[PDB]
Amino acid sequence: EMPINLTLPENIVQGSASAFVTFVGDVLGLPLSNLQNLLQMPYGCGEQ
Amino acid sequence: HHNVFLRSEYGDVGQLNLSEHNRLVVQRLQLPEVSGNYSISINGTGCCLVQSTIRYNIPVPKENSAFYVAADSVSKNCLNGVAYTITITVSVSYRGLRNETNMVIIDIQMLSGYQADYPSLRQLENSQQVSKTEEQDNHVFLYL
Ligand SMILES: *[C@@H]1O[C@H](CO)[C@@H](O)[C@H](O)[C@H]1NC(C)=O
Ligand SMILES: *[C@@H]1O[C@H](CO)[C@@H](O)[C@H](O)[C@H]1NC(C)=O
Numbered sequence: 442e443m444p445i446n447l448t449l450p451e452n453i454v455q456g457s458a459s460a461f462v463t464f465v466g467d468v469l470g471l472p473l474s475n476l477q478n479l480l481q482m483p484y485g486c487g488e489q
Numbered sequence: 490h491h492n493v494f495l496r497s498e499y500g501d502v503g504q505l506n507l508s509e510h511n512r513l514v515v516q517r518l519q520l521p522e523v524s525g526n527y528s529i530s531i532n533g534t535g536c537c538l539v540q541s542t543i544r545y546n547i548p549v550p551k552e553n554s555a556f557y558v559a560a561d562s563v564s565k566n567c568l569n570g571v572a573y574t575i576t577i578t579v580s581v582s583y584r585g586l587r588n589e590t591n592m593v594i595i596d597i598q599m600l601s602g603y604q605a606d607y608p609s610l611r612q613l614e615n616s617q618q619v620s621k622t623e624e625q626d627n628h629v630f631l632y633l
């Protein structure tokens with residue numbers, strides 16, 4: 442029965458705030474539909 | 490078997506069920522109040538993951554010592570306010586205690602209604618300072 446420990450930082454831009462909760466039926470289920478986009482950081486190299 | 494449910498001090502937000510069918514699809518929840526006091530619970534037998542994320546924007550927190558960057562720009566054809574052509578120049582330096590730095594990525598967001606100069610980007614490329622350029626979704630990425 443755990444609460445959610447959320448605290449928006451001070452000096453925050455008004456209107457830009459969203460609280461999301463993600464649930465998965467399997468432990469390794471989240472990295473399935475986002476395989477092309479595991480990370481928002483851009484690509485461009487061989488290791489990337 | 491899993492049944493999960495979220496509560497606030499005013500009511501129950503969500504009541505979801507996880508079973509053999511509901512195993513590979515992700516469940517999305519969005520809190521209507523961003524500063525509330527919520528509590529989740531999962532009941533049943535098995536193993537599950539819970540993720541809680543907060544998304545916001547901050548106004549360029551350049552107040553502490555960090556990987557030093559100083560960005561500015563100049564105009565050349567300034568006319569009646571808005572200038573048709575802009576010239577962006579940035580300065581980068583490293584101030585950490587590490588031995589030596591690795592490859593770095595610089596991202597510049599376009600100033601609202603503008604677009605990249607492809608000849609300028611390719612001139613930067615053929616000059617030997619940036620090994621890769623990229624432009625997409627009004628962000629220009631240079632890989633140093
Ligand atoms: C989590 O709880 C701590 C109290 O131990 C609090 O200082 C913090 O602001 C809360 N939120 C985050 C995101 O750490
Ligand atoms: C179990 O999940 C199914 C999915 O449709 C649905 O009947 C309901 O959400 C759950 N049933 C329960 C908790 O009895």
Ligand SMILES: *[C@@H]1O[C@H](CO)[C@@H](O)[C@H](O)[C@H]1NC(C)=O
Nearest residue numbers: 444497498524525526527528
């Ligand atoms: C929210 O609920 C928590 C539960 O422990 C408690 O701090 C209090 O009842 C509420 N806090 C508020 C309304 O700031």
Ligand SMILES: *[C@@H]1O[C@H](CO)[C@@H](O)[C@H](O)[C@H]1NC(C)=O
Nearest residue numbers: 584585586587588589590591
């Ligand atoms: C870090 O490692 C480098 C070797 O690459 C060498 O200069 C020294 O052993 C270390 N310290 C500094 C300040 O570079």
